[PDB]
């Protein structure tokens, strides 16, 4: 998992 939380809504 390399997805920062500000990119969750995308």
């Amino acid at each position, epitope marked *: *998992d*390399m997805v*920062d*939380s*500000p990119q*969750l*809504a995308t």
Partner: antibody
Amino acid sequence: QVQLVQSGAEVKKPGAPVKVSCETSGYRFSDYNVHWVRQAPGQGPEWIGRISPNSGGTKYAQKFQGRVTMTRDMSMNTAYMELSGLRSDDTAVYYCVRGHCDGTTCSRAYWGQGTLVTVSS
Amino acid sequence: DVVMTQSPLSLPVTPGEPASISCRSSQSLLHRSGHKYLHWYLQRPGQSPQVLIYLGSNRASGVPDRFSGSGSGTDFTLKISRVEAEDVGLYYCMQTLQTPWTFGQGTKVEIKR
């Protein structure tokens, strides 16, 4: 309220591992990342890594990769952080932190009270 | 890693007078969705960091009305309108647009006499 509650202060000897716990309440544990930060005395704070409770996926900072392990328990709403190969430079206050964004909305950070870890013989 | 540069490092303030702490980032902390990922927190000795201002300008619950935050996507400011002995401590800006989270150098606020 949102509440992160860490285990007690630890005295370990050089090369011993320390396992800190972080128990949570007041929000859906699955929805937010649990990040781990530390502050050594005479040093600025430092981000160690992060765990996603639902997936279990972890990201660690390069300097910590290969000696830190983060796990979680969904049933007990608890996050853990096991650091190994301790030396005097690992003496610090260790803080678990709730992340900001959950998919729908982005909010504030919520910090645990801290856990002092003393590396000494 | 995003580089935060905070200034000034030391800040004596006469009681009642205001205080301004600046913090700039190497790249924009304004995400395209509109949210600015910069946070201001206070460190007193022997206790957890107290969140003062989050997501650029939003005041945290139970923080006094004299604390305020503003800024563009790269240049930020913490404003305290009336400093008192309660406010003495070590102030930090931090970014959470990208992991690793990175922190400013710190500002040591003290009362001036």
